[PDB]
Design a binder for this molecule. Structure first.
Ligand SMILES: Nc1nc2c(ncn2[C@@H]2O[C@H](COP(=O)(O)OP(=O)(O)NP(=O)(O)O)[C@@H](O)[C@H]2O)c(=O)[nH]1
Ligand SMILES: [Mg+2]
Length: 171
């Protein structure tokens, strides 16, 4: 053993939950404490489809094998920036590198008070069909929703980032 190294770079607007996504996945605990930019990258040794992989995860302020573009499901402004900023920025460096679109803070999309404070701003959470359509719009290989807090959807984000590298499409 013998494992494949895969580099994954995580981008998206400020406060969408990139750091908490990576820490929750790699330590299995949502961080209830301050996180100094001491760490800009995290690591996980994972088995996907019977294949041992060293997943290297690179965090940013909001050569990759795969990118995660993240937006908060309760921030329409972060969602618009997926196509306005993050997709063009990734594609200038890397025309072909797969992208996974990730909607974060899934626990808040059905949260009553987060729905109610948005409604004061004539905003509403991003729905699953809207996210899926934005993924098609930016040519993302997959669209996934997750909560770092509850860990719902969290493992699948990384499993899919890995499958995107290990199993590229025909062509
Ligand atoms: N309810 C909920 N809050 C979350 C979740 N993930 C992160 N948060 C909260 O969202 C805020 C931002 O999280 P953080 O991971 O620091 O975001 P970031 O994208 O790294 N920010 P930056 O780009 O500035 O470094 C924090 O208050 C954090 O607790 C989640 O899944 N659910
Ligand atoms: Mg951060």
């Amino acid at each position: 053993g013998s494992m494949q190294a895969i580099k994954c770079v995580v981008v998206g607007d400020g406060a969408v939950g990139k750091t908490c996504l990576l820490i929750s996945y790699t330590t299995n605990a949502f961080p209830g404490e301050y996180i100094p930019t001491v760490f800009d990258n995290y690591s996980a040794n994972v088995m996907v489809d019977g294949k041992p992989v060293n997943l290297g995860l690179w965090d940013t302020a909001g050569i990759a094998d795969v990118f995660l573009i993240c937006f908060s499901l309760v921030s329409p402004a972060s969602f618009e920036n997926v196509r306005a900023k993050w997709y063009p920025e990734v594609r200038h460096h890397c025309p072909n590198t797969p992208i996974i679109l990730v909607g974060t803070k899934l626990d808040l999309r059905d949260d009553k008070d987060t729905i109610e404070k948005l409604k004061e701003k004539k905003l509403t959470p991003i729905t699953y069909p809207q996210g899926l359509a934005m993924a098609k719009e930016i040519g993302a290989v997959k669209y996934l929703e997750c909560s770092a807090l509850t860990q719902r959807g969290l493992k699948t984000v990384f499993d899919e980032a890995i499958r995107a590298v290990l199993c590229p499409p025909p062509v």
